[PDB]
Amino acid sequence: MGCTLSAEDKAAVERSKMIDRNLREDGEKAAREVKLLLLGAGESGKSTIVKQMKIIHEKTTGIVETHFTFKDLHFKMFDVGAQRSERKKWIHCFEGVTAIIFCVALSDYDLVLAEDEEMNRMHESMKLFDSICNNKWFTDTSIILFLNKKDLFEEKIKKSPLTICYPEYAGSNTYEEAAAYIQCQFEDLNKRKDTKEIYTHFTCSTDTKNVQFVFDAVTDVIIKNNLKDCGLF
Amino acid sequence: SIAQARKLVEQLKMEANIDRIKVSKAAADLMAYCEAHAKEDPLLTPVPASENPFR
Amino acid sequence: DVQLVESGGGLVQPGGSRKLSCSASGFAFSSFGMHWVRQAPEKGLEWVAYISSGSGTIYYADTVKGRFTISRDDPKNTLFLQMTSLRSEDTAMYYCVRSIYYYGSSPFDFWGQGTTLTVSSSDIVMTQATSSVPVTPGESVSISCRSSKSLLHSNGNTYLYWFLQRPGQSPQLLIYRMSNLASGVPDRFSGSGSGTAFTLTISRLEAEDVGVYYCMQHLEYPLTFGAGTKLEL
Amino acid sequence: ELDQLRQEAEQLKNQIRDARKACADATLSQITNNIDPVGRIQMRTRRTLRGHLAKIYAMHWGTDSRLLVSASQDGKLIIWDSYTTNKVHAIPLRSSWVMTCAYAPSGNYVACGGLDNICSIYNLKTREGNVRVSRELAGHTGYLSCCRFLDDNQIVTSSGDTTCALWDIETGQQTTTFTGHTGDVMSLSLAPDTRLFVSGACDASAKLWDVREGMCRQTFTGHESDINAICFFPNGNAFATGSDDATCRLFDLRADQELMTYSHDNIICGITSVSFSKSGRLLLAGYDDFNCNVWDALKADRAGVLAGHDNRVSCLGVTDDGMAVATGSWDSFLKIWN
Amino acid sequence: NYSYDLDYYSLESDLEEKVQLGVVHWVSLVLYCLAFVLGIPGNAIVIWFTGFKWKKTVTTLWFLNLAIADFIFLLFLPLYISYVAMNFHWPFGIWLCKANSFTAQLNMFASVFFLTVISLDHYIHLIHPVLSHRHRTLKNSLIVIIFIWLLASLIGGPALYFRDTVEFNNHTLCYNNFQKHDPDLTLIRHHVLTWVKFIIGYLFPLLTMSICYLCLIFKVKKRSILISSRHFWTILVVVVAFVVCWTPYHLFSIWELTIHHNSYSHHVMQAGIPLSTGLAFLNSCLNPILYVLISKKFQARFRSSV
Amino acid sequence: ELTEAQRRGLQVALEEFHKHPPVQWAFQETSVESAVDTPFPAGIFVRLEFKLQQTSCRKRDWKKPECKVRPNGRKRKCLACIKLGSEDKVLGRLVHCPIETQVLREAEEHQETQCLRVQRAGEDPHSFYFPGQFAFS
Ligand SMILES: CC(C)CCC[C@@H](C)[C@H]1CC[C@H]2[C@@H]3CC=C4C[C@@H](O)CC[C@]4(C)[C@H]3CC[C@]12C
């Protein structure tokens, strides 16, 4: 007969079913948002970068959220600035992120690291890159490489050649031969050539093209994963 | 620097003062505990299905 | 600030219509089930209707079914009882009662202050043989209630409730499930009993314990009250 | 003097090791050598709880073996009822990155914490009718890795800034702060008498702190990787630690020494959770092989496998009465076994 | 005594010759049997594995509804096999005709509509991410499923009004009566009914399926993603099956209209309609074998279901 | 004057009736309620409604005229919509006559709708073909 439950237990079943639905309806809204990580080498224009796509949404806190909307698409972006602990313990939390924004300031080729010596900032950023690009978790996650500080680097080229950071460089010390070389040197560390892709970009221009680029790239990643991870069902 | 080393040696000095027993006695207490409580262990000896609240 | 305030009562010609309101003030109207409870001018309590949380489940007393409708306005935090074809048997005090059903909850815990309606001129039976008893302050007194059906359900719960109505005051729940003490009720109250036989014991009775005590059942949702045991002196 | 201090510290280490050896004799296998084995323990999935649609990162039974609380990174704490399936509460979180949960012994409060460096204490028995944020303890720098209640007004947290802290819910400040770990702390387990508590760091060490004064008392060392889980023996005189090198070790408080190691040359993945059973004969350890194993606490031989999980198991609990064992993995689906 | 029979009504003429068994009839019967015995278990497996033993996605909703429609369509096949086995004899009463025809028509049209919507949803979901992230929820799925079922019922409704039964040459045929009251407009009624069936059931679904399944491939090739080998062969098989197993039935239904003007023949319509119906039932059986079972995800689940 | 075509139609209708398996004791034509005739470019069509009285003759003894009419037998009112061609060959025929307890309104409608189909037979080749005999819808 199945009517072995009291009135109170049937009301409890009612409460349980109301709860789970509320839960399902809430969780459906959390699957339509594109999630991005905001890895950065430090001492870059990360504040300027977050300001650039913050206007479109008109003790140590650790994780910092940033919500914004572009072309009817909702982006949540996670910044980890205050996390000085070991990266091997919380890096698997972001397993299902759509993309990893990776900020690099191409003006620290000559500026040696503070509180240290004979350790260039660019070398440290390169180590960070070939430290997250080969993670056993981020194997199908794309990287959007942002390259900041165009004007300062352009001014500094005429004063400091690039031979200091790359003694093996053979090209001329000017634009269109240093930026491309830097991007190429930053792209060879991608060991997973067949699965992930690098959407390199130059920035620090006071335009609105940065958010447009993130938009394009996230659309490509989405389409490719759909049409590859889905059949007929 | 030196303060960390001082605190570390002080802690290590404090540590080396407790009294310890033979491993045989600790094993004996452990064995006595596991033998004297095997009656109320639903996992060691499965409970009959009459008094099992889980199906 | 948990008060429930009733409104809409008054003198109504027989066969007419009247609407009663219950404005919850100071808590979430949703996540609660609501009950109406009726008390004749010189008679004990009598359950009227019940609407669950989310309005998914509705029940009526057979003496009012078809004539009455119960509803809720959750955004406005209001409970409504629309009342049609009013007979002379519907002159009473109507009370708005909240009750929440989950594991370990306390249904019927808070009662409204009630509104007055005067109309101008099977079911488990709860038995309280003792209509009145004289008690001296400082003494210990036991009230007995008896059931026509075993209130003890297969899940271990014995759906008996004890309420106290001090004269010129709204009912206040004392005990739920025949053994659990309410919040804010002193420990000198206690409840015990077997199936179909229950007792409420007041140890060292002192002032403000005088009044009418009611026993209400819920083995099956249908809830019937006792006649009421009245304590004086 | 750096050199003099290093030399005397080395000689202190040598003498403490010599004393630990001086209190060494025949081990457990020389006392368990003659005792009939338990046999083969076969378990069955009595119930399965679903509705999280994310990764499960923690769980904790109540004092009565009926209610449990689970935390997931969909931004949800859920209070399941073990008997039947109904949910009593579904609390949303301000921060959706949570790695801990805890059930108060009185059953009146719940706790949560994660990458936000803040411990949230949620109330359960309110007049209004909703689950509120009773307290928000802040003051840690790194993430919170474990959080266990001690009373209805005290709570011990172990964080990623290489510190543990005994709080005070009323005032909200650190009543006491335990330091001395040169690495992240990712474990916590309170003694039955709630006076001493042990913690295992990320530098392969387990320290036994005294709650009253707040000074380290004993340090047990030896491992090949980090420590991910710690649980006290029911007697309150020993504990078992799980690491990333596929080894679970047993340490004794009165002997300052290792007793047994439950390792097999067939498993290489680490251990995510460790829990004894009542009467202290079965040690249940959850692995990254999407299954948990049951070891004899004396014979140190595998005697059961629970492999009803798809992804890696992350939380494991045994009820107070020893009736059932509930596991939670990275694909929702909390499962109760008996 | 001799008594009497309730009533007799012998409408016949010797100008025509009766139906007899031929080569095509046995093929049609074996096709019906094969389709039934291979479509009941597959549909049952799909409905059990999708409706209950799984979650509720959107694609699973599409396949749930399609499997339900195909299973209900195949359930009432034995009535048709019994009708066609006894040289087109129908003894189950008049009302069961009006019921069975309505059920078959409704199931067929619902299945065709669900194939069309599966194709369109597949293309939109696999090409447009921004558009898909909105307007793709459970509420919209329920609304469109309800609309599809209502439209299919409305399309199948007229069979409940026009169907009838007539005795003829020691038989009892079940047919569509377009000559209810007057024969002045029966031509118009027959034409509008068959042309509506042809347009809604054949032209629109085939055009939509081809357009979506070709635009998806063209855009993917433009984006240079090198679609898998399982695709372009799990896609080009379903279209081929639809066009082979549904065209030589609408063809015959269209030829049916030439009765009014001139055909001077009956053998062509004598054998070829049972074969067409056999092909349609074969498609209804083959839908879940080719749509969900062949897919790697369901096979992986089946292997993991041990 | 009464012609011979209606006689041929009525007699063939009665012969078809006397081919009755279950109902024995064949009737005999007594009074004709109505009998109309019409020529078509393909043949002569006759519609009849006639009254028959049960007779003591055997069903095999209907052609013989010595049958004795019994007024206390049974009465029948039967309709025959038939048409013939050259050499008065019967090609299309429909006979009908149920019990007065029937509705006789839907029956009349369907009998007229089928007699019209009988009328156009022969002139239209596929007259006796109903739309949708072999399909399931
Ligand atoms: C013989 C004919 C009438 C059968 C058609 C009626 C039934 C089978 C149809 C009509 C309405 C349909 C239901 C309406 C929508 C839903 C919700 C979704 O979860 C799919 C199943 C379900 C529940 C459908 C199942 C099939 C359905 C029940």
PDB file of N, CA, C and O in Angstrom, chain E residues 13-61:
ATOM      1  N   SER E  13     -19.842  -7.042 -56.263  1.00  0.00           N
ATOM      2  CA  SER E  13     -19.958  -7.094 -57.711  1.00  0.00           C
ATOM      3  C   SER E  13     -18.872  -8.009 -58.254  1.00  0.00           C
ATOM      4  O   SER E  13     -17.783  -8.109 -57.686  1.00  0.00           O
ATOM      5  N   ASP E  14     -19.183  -8.673 -59.362  1.00  0.00           N
ATOM      6  CA  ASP E  14     -18.284  -9.647 -59.961  1.00  0.00           C
ATOM      7  C   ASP E  14     -17.352  -9.039 -61.001  1.00  0.00           C
ATOM      8  O   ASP E  14     -16.592  -9.780 -61.634  1.00  0.00           O
ATOM      9  N   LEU E  15     -17.397  -7.721 -61.200  1.00  0.00           N
ATOM     10  CA  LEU E  15     -16.531  -7.101 -62.197  1.00  0.00           C
ATOM     11  C   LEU E  15     -15.067  -7.190 -61.782  1.00  0.00           C
ATOM     12  O   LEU E  15     -14.188  -7.390 -62.629  1.00  0.00           O
ATOM     13  N   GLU E  16     -14.784  -7.047 -60.492  1.00  0.00           N
ATOM     14  CA  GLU E  16     -13.424  -7.163 -59.991  1.00  0.00           C
ATOM     15  C   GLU E  16     -13.128  -8.587 -59.532  1.00  0.00           C
ATOM     16  O   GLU E  16     -14.022  -9.419 -59.364  1.00  0.00           O
ATOM     17  N   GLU E  17     -11.843  -8.858 -59.324  1.00  0.00           N
ATOM     18  CA  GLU E  17     -11.372 -10.145 -58.837  1.00  0.00           C
ATOM     19  C   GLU E  17     -10.763  -9.959 -57.454  1.00  0.00           C
ATOM     20  O   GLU E  17     -10.125  -8.938 -57.179  1.00  0.00           O
ATOM     21  N   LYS E  18     -10.964 -10.949 -56.590  1.00  0.00           N
ATOM     22  CA  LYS E  18     -10.612 -10.809 -55.187  1.00  0.00           C
ATOM     23  C   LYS E  18      -9.099 -10.766 -54.983  1.00  0.00           C
ATOM     24  O   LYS E  18      -8.305 -11.048 -55.885  1.00  0.00           O
ATOM     25  N   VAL E  19      -8.713 -10.389 -53.764  1.00  0.00           N
ATOM     26  CA  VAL E  19      -7.315 -10.419 -53.356  1.00  0.00           C
ATOM     27  C   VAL E  19      -6.866 -11.861 -53.156  1.00  0.00           C
ATOM     28  O   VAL E  19      -7.627 -12.710 -52.670  1.00  0.00           O
ATOM     29  N   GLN E  20      -5.630 -12.151 -53.555  1.00  0.00           N
ATOM     30  CA  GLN E  20      -5.008 -13.443 -53.316  1.00  0.00           C
ATOM     31  C   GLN E  20      -3.580 -13.216 -52.832  1.00  0.00           C
ATOM     32  O   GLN E  20      -2.993 -12.151 -53.040  1.00  0.00           O
ATOM     33  N   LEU E  21      -3.018 -14.230 -52.181  1.00  0.00           N
ATOM     34  CA  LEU E  21      -1.650 -14.132 -51.690  1.00  0.00           C
ATOM     35  C   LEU E  21      -0.663 -14.067 -52.847  1.00  0.00           C
ATOM     36  O   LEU E  21      -0.829 -14.743 -53.866  1.00  0.00           O
ATOM     37  N   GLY E  22       0.366 -13.243 -52.685  1.00  0.00           N
ATOM     38  CA  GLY E  22       1.404 -13.120 -53.687  1.00  0.00           C
ATOM     39  C   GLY E  22       2.792 -13.141 -53.081  1.00  0.00           C
ATOM     40  O   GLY E  22       2.949 -13.417 -51.889  1.00  0.00           O
ATOM     41  N   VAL E  23       3.807 -12.856 -53.896  1.00  0.00           N
ATOM     42  CA  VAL E  23       5.176 -12.814 -53.390  1.00  0.00           C
ATOM     43  C   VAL E  23       5.336 -11.686 -52.379  1.00  0.00           C
ATOM     44  O   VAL E  23       5.955 -11.859 -51.323  1.00  0.00           O
ATOM     45  N   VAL E  24       4.758 -10.520 -52.677  1.00  0.00           N
ATOM     46  CA  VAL E  24       4.970  -9.334 -51.855  1.00  0.00           C
ATOM     47  C   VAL E  24       4.363  -9.492 -50.465  1.00  0.00           C
ATOM     48  O   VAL E  24       4.890  -8.947 -49.488  1.00  0.00           O
ATOM     49  N   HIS E  25       3.240 -10.204 -50.350  1.00  0.00           N
ATOM     50  CA  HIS E  25       2.554 -10.299 -49.064  1.00  0.00           C
ATOM     51  C   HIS E  25       3.395 -11.031 -48.024  1.00  0.00           C
ATOM     52  O   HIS E  25       3.446 -10.624 -46.857  1.00  0.00           O
ATOM     53  N   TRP E  26       4.052 -12.122 -48.419  1.00  0.00           N
ATOM     54  CA  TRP E  26       4.892 -12.849 -47.474  1.00  0.00           C
ATOM     55  C   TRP E  26       6.080 -12.004 -47.032  1.00  0.00           C
ATOM     56  O   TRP E  26       6.458 -12.021 -45.853  1.00  0.00           O
ATOM     57  N   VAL E  27       6.675 -11.258 -47.964  1.00  0.00           N
ATOM     58  CA  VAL E  27       7.758 -10.347 -47.609  1.00  0.00           C
ATOM     59  C   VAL E  27       7.267  -9.304 -46.617  1.00  0.00           C
ATOM     60  O   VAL E  27       7.957  -8.976 -45.646  1.00  0.00           O
ATOM     61  N   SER E  28       6.067  -8.767 -46.845  1.00  0.00           N
ATOM     62  CA  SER E  28       5.517  -7.771 -45.933  1.00  0.00           C
ATOM     63  C   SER E  28       5.283  -8.358 -44.548  1.00  0.00           C
ATOM     64  O   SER E  28       5.562  -7.709 -43.533  1.00  0.00           O
ATOM     65  N   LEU E  29       4.765  -9.587 -44.486  1.00  0.00           N
ATOM     66  CA  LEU E  29       4.517 -10.217 -43.193  1.00  0.00           C
ATOM     67  C   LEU E  29       5.817 -10.466 -42.438  1.00  0.00           C
ATOM     68  O   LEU E  29       5.903 -10.212 -41.227  1.00  0.00           O
ATOM     69  N   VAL E  30       6.844 -10.961 -43.135  1.00  0.00           N
ATOM     70  CA  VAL E  30       8.115 -11.194 -42.461  1.00  0.00           C
ATOM     71  C   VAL E  30       8.745  -9.870 -42.044  1.00  0.00           C
ATOM     72  O   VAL E  30       9.403  -9.793 -41.002  1.00  0.00           O
ATOM     73  N   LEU E  31       8.539  -8.805 -42.825  1.00  0.00           N
ATOM     74  CA  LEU E  31       9.031  -7.493 -42.424  1.00  0.00           C
ATOM     75  C   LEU E  31       8.343  -7.013 -41.154  1.00  0.00           C
ATOM     76  O   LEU E  31       9.000  -6.486 -40.249  1.00  0.00           O
ATOM     77  N   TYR E  32       7.021  -7.193 -41.063  1.00  0.00           N
ATOM     78  CA  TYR E  32       6.310  -6.806 -39.845  1.00  0.00           C
ATOM     79  C   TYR E  32       6.840  -7.576 -38.644  1.00  0.00           C
ATOM     80  O   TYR E  32       7.103  -6.995 -37.583  1.00  0.00           O
ATOM     81  N   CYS E  33       6.994  -8.894 -38.792  1.00  0.00           N
ATOM     82  CA  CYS E  33       7.457  -9.707 -37.671  1.00  0.00           C
ATOM     83  C   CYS E  33       8.861  -9.301 -37.239  1.00  0.00           C
ATOM     84  O   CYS E  33       9.138  -9.150 -36.041  1.00  0.00           O
ATOM     85  N   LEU E  34       9.762  -9.112 -38.207  1.00  0.00           N
ATOM     86  CA  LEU E  34      11.128  -8.717 -37.888  1.00  0.00           C
ATOM     87  C   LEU E  34      11.155  -7.368 -37.187  1.00  0.00           C
ATOM     88  O   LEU E  34      11.836  -7.199 -36.168  1.00  0.00           O
ATOM     89  N   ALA E  35      10.402  -6.398 -37.710  1.00  0.00           N
ATOM     90  CA  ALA E  35      10.392  -5.070 -37.112  1.00  0.00           C
ATOM     91  C   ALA E  35       9.853  -5.113 -35.693  1.00  0.00           C
ATOM     92  O   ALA E  35      10.413  -4.482 -34.794  1.00  0.00           O
ATOM     93  N   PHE E  36       8.780  -5.871 -35.463  1.00  0.00           N
ATOM     94  CA  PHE E  36       8.215  -5.961 -34.121  1.00  0.00           C
ATOM     95  C   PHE E  36       9.204  -6.590 -33.145  1.00  0.00           C
ATOM     96  O   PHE E  36       9.501  -6.020 -32.082  1.00  0.00           O
ATOM     97  N   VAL E  37       9.746  -7.762 -33.499  1.00  0.00           N
ATOM     98  CA  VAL E  37      10.609  -8.486 -32.571  1.00  0.00           C
ATOM     99  C   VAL E  37      11.956  -7.805 -32.382  1.00  0.00           C
ATOM    100  O   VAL E  37      12.646  -8.083 -31.397  1.00  0.00           O
ATOM    101  N   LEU E  38      12.364  -6.926 -33.297  1.00  0.00           N
ATOM    102  CA  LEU E  38      13.608  -6.194 -33.118  1.00  0.00           C
ATOM    103  C   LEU E  38      13.401  -4.775 -32.607  1.00  0.00           C
ATOM    104  O   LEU E  38      14.384  -4.102 -32.286  1.00  0.00           O
ATOM    105  N   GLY E  39      12.161  -4.305 -32.530  1.00  0.00           N
ATOM    106  CA  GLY E  39      11.914  -2.958 -32.067  1.00  0.00           C
ATOM    107  C   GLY E  39      11.348  -2.888 -30.669  1.00  0.00           C
ATOM    108  O   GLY E  39      11.576  -1.901 -29.966  1.00  0.00           O
ATOM    109  N   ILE E  40      10.599  -3.910 -30.247  1.00  0.00           N
ATOM    110  CA  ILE E  40      10.121  -3.938 -28.862  1.00  0.00           C
ATOM    111  C   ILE E  40      11.275  -4.022 -27.866  1.00  0.00           C
ATOM    112  O   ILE E  40      11.312  -3.203 -26.929  1.00  0.00           O
ATOM    113  N   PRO E  41      12.245  -4.938 -28.002  1.00  0.00           N
ATOM    114  CA  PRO E  41      13.328  -4.981 -27.006  1.00  0.00           C
ATOM    115  C   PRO E  41      14.223  -3.756 -27.025  1.00  0.00           C
ATOM    116  O   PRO E  41      14.591  -3.256 -25.956  1.00  0.00           O
ATOM    117  N   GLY E  42      14.605  -3.268 -28.207  1.00  0.00           N
ATOM    118  CA  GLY E  42      15.463  -2.094 -28.264  1.00  0.00           C
ATOM    119  C   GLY E  42      14.807  -0.868 -27.661  1.00  0.00           C
ATOM    120  O   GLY E  42      15.429  -0.133 -26.886  1.00  0.00           O
ATOM    121  N   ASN E  43      13.538  -0.637 -27.998  1.00  0.00           N
ATOM    122  CA  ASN E  43      12.815   0.487 -27.416  1.00  0.00           C
ATOM    123  C   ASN E  43      12.662   0.322 -25.912  1.00  0.00           C
ATOM    124  O   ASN E  43      12.768   1.300 -25.163  1.00  0.00           O
ATOM    125  N   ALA E  44      12.409  -0.905 -25.446  1.00  0.00           N
ATOM    126  CA  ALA E  44      12.303  -1.130 -24.007  1.00  0.00           C
ATOM    127  C   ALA E  44      13.618  -0.816 -23.302  1.00  0.00           C
ATOM    128  O   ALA E  44      13.632  -0.174 -22.244  1.00  0.00           O
ATOM    129  N   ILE E  45      14.734  -1.254 -23.883  1.00  0.00           N
ATOM    130  CA  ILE E  45      16.041  -0.987 -23.289  1.00  0.00           C
ATOM    131  C   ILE E  45      16.297   0.512 -23.230  1.00  0.00           C
ATOM    132  O   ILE E  45      16.735   1.047 -22.203  1.00  0.00           O
ATOM    133  N   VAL E  46      16.014   1.217 -24.329  1.00  0.00           N
ATOM    134  CA  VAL E  46      16.268   2.653 -24.367  1.00  0.00           C
ATOM    135  C   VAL E  46      15.393   3.382 -23.357  1.00  0.00           C
ATOM    136  O   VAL E  46      15.863   4.275 -22.644  1.00  0.00           O
ATOM    137  N   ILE E  47      14.113   3.013 -23.272  1.00  0.00           N
ATOM    138  CA  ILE E  47      13.218   3.717 -22.362  1.00  0.00           C
ATOM    139  C   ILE E  47      13.607   3.457 -20.910  1.00  0.00           C
ATOM    140  O   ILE E  47      13.585   4.381 -20.086  1.00  0.00           O
ATOM    141  N   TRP E  48      14.029   2.231 -20.579  1.00  0.00           N
ATOM    142  CA  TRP E  48      14.439   1.960 -19.204  1.00  0.00           C
ATOM    143  C   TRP E  48      15.740   2.673 -18.863  1.00  0.00           C
ATOM    144  O   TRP E  48      15.878   3.232 -17.769  1.00  0.00           O
ATOM    145  N   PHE E  49      16.705   2.670 -19.783  1.00  0.00           N
ATOM    146  CA  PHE E  49      18.000   3.270 -19.501  1.00  0.00           C
ATOM    147  C   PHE E  49      17.964   4.791 -19.527  1.00  0.00           C
ATOM    148  O   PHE E  49      18.825   5.426 -18.910  1.00  0.00           O
ATOM    149  N   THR E  50      16.997   5.391 -20.219  1.00  0.00           N
ATOM    150  CA  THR E  50      16.931   6.843 -20.319  1.00  0.00           C
ATOM    151  C   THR E  50      15.964   7.449 -19.309  1.00  0.00           C
ATOM    152  O   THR E  50      16.326   8.381 -18.584  1.00  0.00           O
ATOM    153  N   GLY E  51      14.732   6.940 -19.252  1.00  0.00           N
ATOM    154  CA  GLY E  51      13.732   7.562 -18.403  1.00  0.00           C
ATOM    155  C   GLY E  51      14.056   7.473 -16.924  1.00  0.00           C
ATOM    156  O   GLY E  51      13.925   8.459 -16.195  1.00  0.00           O
ATOM    157  N   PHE E  52      14.483   6.298 -16.459  1.00  0.00           N
ATOM    158  CA  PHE E  52      14.648   6.044 -15.031  1.00  0.00           C
ATOM    159  C   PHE E  52      16.110   6.009 -14.593  1.00  0.00           C
ATOM    160  O   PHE E  52      16.503   6.740 -13.681  1.00  0.00           O
ATOM    161  N   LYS E  53      16.923   5.165 -15.221  1.00  0.00           N
ATOM    162  CA  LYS E  53      18.304   4.943 -14.786  1.00  0.00           C
ATOM    163  C   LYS E  53      19.273   5.956 -15.389  1.00  0.00           C
ATOM    164  O   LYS E  53      20.282   5.588 -15.989  1.00  0.00           O
ATOM    165  N   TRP E  54      18.984   7.241 -15.217  1.00  0.00           N
ATOM    166  CA  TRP E  54      19.835   8.312 -15.727  1.00  0.00           C
ATOM    167  C   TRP E  54      19.330   9.631 -15.156  1.00  0.00           C
ATOM    168  O   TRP E  54      18.341   9.674 -14.418  1.00  0.00           O
ATOM    169  N   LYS E  55      20.022  10.710 -15.508  1.00  0.00           N
ATOM    170  CA  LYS E  55      19.601  12.057 -15.158  1.00  0.00           C
ATOM    171  C   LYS E  55      18.645  12.573 -16.231  1.00  0.00           C
ATOM    172  O   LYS E  55      18.176  11.819 -17.088  1.00  0.00           O
ATOM    173  N   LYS E  56      18.340  13.867 -16.199  1.00  0.00           N
ATOM    174  CA  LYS E  56      17.414  14.479 -17.149  1.00  0.00           C
ATOM    175  C   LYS E  56      18.114  15.647 -17.838  1.00  0.00           C
ATOM    176  O   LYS E  56      18.023  16.794 -17.394  1.00  0.00           O
ATOM    177  N   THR E  57      18.812  15.346 -18.927  1.00  0.00           N
ATOM    178  CA  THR E  57      19.409  16.358 -19.783  1.00  0.00           C
ATOM    179  C   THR E  57      18.361  16.759 -20.824  1.00  0.00           C
ATOM    180  O   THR E  57      17.185  16.409 -20.708  1.00  0.00           O
ATOM    181  N   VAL E  58      18.762  17.502 -21.849  1.00  0.00           N
ATOM    182  CA  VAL E  58      17.857  17.840 -22.943  1.00  0.00           C
ATOM    183  C   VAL E  58      17.853  16.753 -24.010  1.00  0.00           C
ATOM    184  O   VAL E  58      16.794  16.329 -24.484  1.00  0.00           O
ATOM    185  N   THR E  59      19.040  16.281 -24.396  1.00  0.00           N
ATOM    186  CA  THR E  59      19.126  15.208 -25.380  1.00  0.00           C
ATOM    187  C   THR E  59      18.469  13.937 -24.863  1.00  0.00           C
ATOM    188  O   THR E  59      17.799  13.220 -25.621  1.00  0.00           O
ATOM    189  N   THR E  60      18.653  13.633 -23.577  1.00  0.00           N
ATOM    190  CA  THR E  60      17.960  12.488 -23.001  1.00  0.00           C
ATOM    191  C   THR E  60      16.453  12.676 -23.049  1.00  0.00           C
ATOM    192  O   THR E  60      15.721  11.703 -23.226  1.00  0.00           O
ATOM    193  N   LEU E  61      15.967  13.912 -22.904  1.00  0.00           N
ATOM    194  CA  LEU E  61      14.535  14.153 -23.049  1.00  0.00           C
ATOM    195  C   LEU E  61      14.071  13.871 -24.473  1.00  0.00           C
ATOM    196  O   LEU E  61      13.029  13.229 -24.682  1.00  0.00           O
TER     197      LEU E  61
END
